[PDB]
Design an enzyme around this catalytic site. Structure first.
Site, PDB file in Angstrom:
ATOM      1  N   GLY A 232       0.806  -1.202   0.000  1.00  0.00           N
ATOM      2  CA  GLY A 232       0.000   0.000   0.000  1.00  0.00           C
ATOM      3  C   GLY A 232       0.845   1.259   0.000  1.00  0.00           C
ATOM      4  CB  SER A 233      -0.205   4.816  -0.222  1.00  0.00           C
ATOM      5  OG  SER A 233      -1.397   4.582   0.498  1.00  0.00           O
ATOM      6  CB  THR A 234       2.211   2.010   4.360  1.00  0.00           C
ATOM      7  OG1 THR A 234       0.803   1.807   4.528  1.00  0.00           O
ATOM      8  CG2 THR A 234       2.850   2.272   5.713  1.00  0.00           C
TER       9      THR A 234
ATOM     10  CB  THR B 247      -5.534   3.054   0.291  1.00  0.00           C
ATOM     11  OG1 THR B 247      -4.966   4.055  -0.565  1.00  0.00           O
ATOM     12  CG2 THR B 247      -6.266   3.713   1.438  1.00  0.00           C
TER      13      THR B 247
END
Length: 621
Positions: free
Chosen positions: A370-372, A569
């Site tokens: 995810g964008s983490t 996300t």
């Protein structure tokens, strides 16, 4: 002739416990043909074999000749299973009349006449899986065992009425109660076990019985695993396994079965008619299984599982400076207690057919981070000098693409912020900023920064797991794939444990600390994964992700605890996964990554992380 078939059926009847048919294949009682009556052979075989729980009797080297006009001799090697292990290399010999002239030579090779069998089995205690504070994760507990006493069951219709009553009040076939009541070890006054219960008619009683027990239940079902009764198939793989013990089928019960099972102690020998030792067949000393203490926190595990609320997801909690795996929660889950004891076909089918799949260990399943992953891409960019934290990109709208050569695909952000630097991109979870900086960084520099991490490494953990990968092949072969990998959703596959491993660099000033599950393990780390300046630049921005009123994890600021976080996300097809990364930036006492797989609308990993964060901040400084 057809006497070889007579021997094959005889061993087959003995193998599956049918001693009456096996005895029915014997000759009439005499001195030339057979030494006992059929009932005597029945009772001898039961008393001896069933006491030793003889199963998996397999023969080989079967040779059958023809002695006289009505006699045919036979011989074969045999392998057996008892509560004390495998009886290999057994020479059996005898005669055939086609029937079998039965002699006590066919119970064990060197018995003759009125020899007895000495079985003294008294040991075994499976090792306990305990948490970092000694709390039990897999011990032995007192379980409620419903069974039947045949004498107190009744006569005639009374017995049938009570059997139907017991079978209807606890959901079991009448034929099971009658088959356990009619098995060959039972006596009229004995307690015949039926089931373990998670209104007892005449004859039904319940006892307290020692059995494998999992206190946390589903909360730790994927990690700990469960145990199952050993079959003949399992005895075929490992001979030393006792034919009646329990074997771990999944999780740490299986990964540590040899260390946890020990060895049942006893002695199986042949004695004369007067009880003097003739031959020692098997004998071993009592050795209980070794306990295994893990880094798991019982209450942290339970809280991290309960916070997922039965939704599909996972949560990993570590102490990032040492790598201690405090919590490895996967949801949804299954009941391990009901799994080891008595599990119906309908409930097991409901487990296996659930689309959310409760059986999969989500903490060991590779996912798009995810964008983490933005953090990582930022750190690399700060190490090679590609990304200036001061430089501001002008981004208009919510969608962007490098050029029209991307056709219909565009990178999507959530907030239309015109001026975006690095801190703003981390605060608002900007995917367009990350895509643009990744494309400006290039594939070579990006992969250089990435290969400093654990991509392709097989971690030293007793958990079945695949190594994380950057992409399918060694090259992206696509600007779109490079950009998507930038904000952590291309062909990236990183399981939550590897995610925590990679993200630990922000709590150790650039050094990656490998995760640890066994408490005795030494701390292994990997130095200079990302620069110190990158950490000291990103961590304050990760504080702002919580403290700023428009930070994506602002709801955590109400907790009043030092937090550095980063939400994320991931869109896969559309299905969306939610991610939250969070740790204490003051003392680096704890770190947490949580994921909701295919989140329901309005749900997020940050909406369910407050209580676990409070516990971790209280108990891990």
């Amino acid at each position: 002739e057809a006497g070889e078939k007579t021997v094959e059926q005889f061993v087959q009847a003995l193998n599956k416990g049918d001693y009456n048919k096996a005895a029915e294949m014997t000759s009439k009682k005499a001195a030339n043909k057979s030494a006992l009556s059929e009932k005597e052979i029945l009772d001898k075989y039961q008393n001896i074999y069933g006491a030793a729980d003889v199963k998996g009797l397999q023969i080989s080297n079967l040779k059958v000749d023809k002695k006289d006009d009505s006699t045919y001799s036979f011989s074969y090697k045999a392998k057996m299973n008892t509560s004390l292990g495998e009886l290999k290399d057994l020479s059996y010999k005898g005669t055939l009349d086609t029937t079998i002239n039965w002699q006590p030579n066919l119970v064990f090779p060197e018995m003759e006449g009125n020899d007895k069998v000495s079985l003294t089995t008294q040991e075994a205690a499976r090792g306990n899986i305990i948490d970092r504070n000694g709390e039990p994760l897999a011990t032995t507990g007192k379980l409620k065992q419903l069974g039947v006493v045949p004498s107190k069951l009744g006569d005639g219709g009374e017995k049938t009425a009570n059997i139907k009553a017991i079978a209807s009040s606890f959901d079991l076939t009448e034929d099971a109660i009658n088959q356990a009541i009619s098995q060959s070890w039972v006596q009229p006054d004995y307690f015949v076990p039926l089931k373990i219960i998670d209104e007892l008619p005449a004859g039904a009683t319940i006892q307290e019985v020692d059995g494998r027990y999992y206190p946390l239940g589903e909360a730790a079902a994927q990690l700990i695993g469960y145990v199952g009764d050993i079959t003949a198939e399992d005895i075929d793989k490992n001979p030393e396994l006792s034919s009646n013990g329990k074997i771990g089928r999944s999780g740490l019960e299986m990964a540590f079965d040899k260390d946890l099972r020990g060895t049942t102690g006893g002695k199986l020998s042949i004695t004369d008619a007067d009880g003097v030792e003739k031959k020692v067949l098997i004998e071993h000393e009592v050795q209980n299984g070794k306990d295994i203490k893990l880094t798991i926190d019982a209450k942290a595990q339970k809280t991290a599982f309960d916070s997922l609320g039965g939704k599909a997801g996972s949560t990993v909690a570590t102490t990032p400076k040492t790598g201690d795996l405090l919590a490895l929660a996967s949801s949804p889950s299954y009941d391990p207690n009901k799994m080891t004891n008595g599990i119906s076909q309908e409930d097991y089918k409901a487990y296996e057919e659930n689309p959310e799949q409760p059986f999969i260990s989500r903490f060991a399943t590779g996912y798009a981070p995810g964008s983490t992953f933005k953090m990582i891409t930022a750190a690399i960019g700060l190490d090679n000098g590609t990304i200036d934290p001061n430089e501001v990109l002008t981004i208009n709208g919510l969608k962007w693409q490098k050029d029209s050569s991307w056709g219909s695909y565009q990178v999507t952000r959530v907030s239309d912020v015109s001026q975006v630097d690095l801190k703003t991109a981390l605060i608002y979870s900007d995917n367009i900023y990350t895509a643009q900086e990744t494309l400006k960084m290039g594939e070579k520099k990006f992969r250089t920064g990435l290969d400093k991490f654990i991509f392709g490494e097989d971690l030293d953990l007793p958990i079945s797991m695949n190594p994380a990968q950057i992409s399918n092949e060694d090259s992206f072969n696509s600007d779109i794939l490079l950009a998507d990998t930038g904000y952590g959703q291309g062909e990236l596959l990183i399981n939550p444990i590897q995610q925590a491993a990679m993200y630990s660099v922000f709590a150790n000033n650039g050094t990656l600390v490998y995760p640890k599950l066994i408490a005795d393990k030494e701390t292994k780390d990997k130095k200079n994964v990302i620069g110190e300046t990158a950490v000291q630049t990103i961590v304050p921005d990760l504080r702002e992700v919580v403290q700023d009123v428009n930070g994506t994890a602002h709801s955590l600021s109400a907790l009043g605890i030092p937090l550095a976080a980063k939400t994320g996300t991931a869109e896969i097809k559309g299905k969306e996964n939610s991610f939250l990364f969070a740790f204490n930036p003051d003392n680096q006492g704890y770190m947490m990554v949580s994921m909701l797989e295919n989140k329901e609308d309005d749900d997020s990993a940050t909406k369910r992380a407050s209580e676990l964060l409070q516990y971790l901040n209280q108990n891990y400084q």
